[PDB]
DNA sequence: TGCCGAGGCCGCTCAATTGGTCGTAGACAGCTCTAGCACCGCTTAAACGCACGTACGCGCTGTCCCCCGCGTTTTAACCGCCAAGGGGATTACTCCCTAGTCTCCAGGCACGTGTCAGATATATACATCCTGTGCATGTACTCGGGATATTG
């Protein structure tokens, strides 16, 4: 049902296991990488096909 | 110079108040009482309030005559302060005991009536006690002089 999830990277970018998402959009970006890497790899992980 | 070190602005997360919504349980408002006994209306023969010079009692008044007030300033320590120290008032936790609930259960006594008496009120006669008045001394007072106590 739910088309889109809205997150802030520091709140939702860790641990969350959002394997249901086909795609990721950053509306803005932080001065520090690694945050975004976590935010992406909490979709991109072993559960996906 | 350098470096950097120290420096100054902005999203999480938690923790009281605040206000909102849920549902349910006696307790409030109201009805009909009904029922009855007080309020009323209606007389009566009743007490006690009240509008009203005058005798006159004292509240208020025109005088002079003095202490305590009124004014000054030195000082004197009273009272305020701040800062430090010690503990004891305080806080937060864990174990514990009973405060509180309900429930059953009885009879103690506070409740109520049933009769009718020793009580106290009211009158008349009255004597007596008590008030208001008038009337001596006896003291408690104000003063002066000296002894004892106490402050500086």
- What experiment produced this structure? cryo-EM
User: A21 with A5: CB under 8 angstroms?
Assistant: yes
- Which residues are CB-neighbours of A26 under 8 A, at least 6 positions away? A36, A39
Q: In angstroms, how far is B134 C1' from A17 CA?
A: 126
Among the listed residues A22, A16, A2, the one whose alpha carbon sits nearest the alpha carbon of residue A39: A16
Take residue A7 and report the two structure tokens written for it. 């997150």
Give me the CA A29–C1' B26 separation in Å, rounded: 63
Provide the H-helix boundaries in A1-49: 9-12, 35-41
Length of chain A: 49
Give the span between the Cα atoms of A44 and A20, in whole angstroms. 10
Answer yes or no: are the C-beta atoms of A17 and A47 closer than 8 Å: yes
| Whether the Cβ atoms of residue A24 and residue A40 lie closer than 8 Å to each other | yes
Protein residue ranges contacting nucleic strand B, Cβ under 7 Å: A 8, 10-11
Return d(Cα A16, Cα A38) in angstroms, integer. 10
């Amino acid at each position: 049902d739910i088309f889109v999830f809205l997150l802030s990277t520091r709140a939702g970018g860790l641990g969350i296991n959002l394997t249901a998402a086909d795609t990721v959009i950053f509306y803005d970006s932080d001065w520090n990488p690694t945050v975004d890497q976590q935010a992406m790899d909490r979709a991109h992980r072993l559960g996906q096909t």
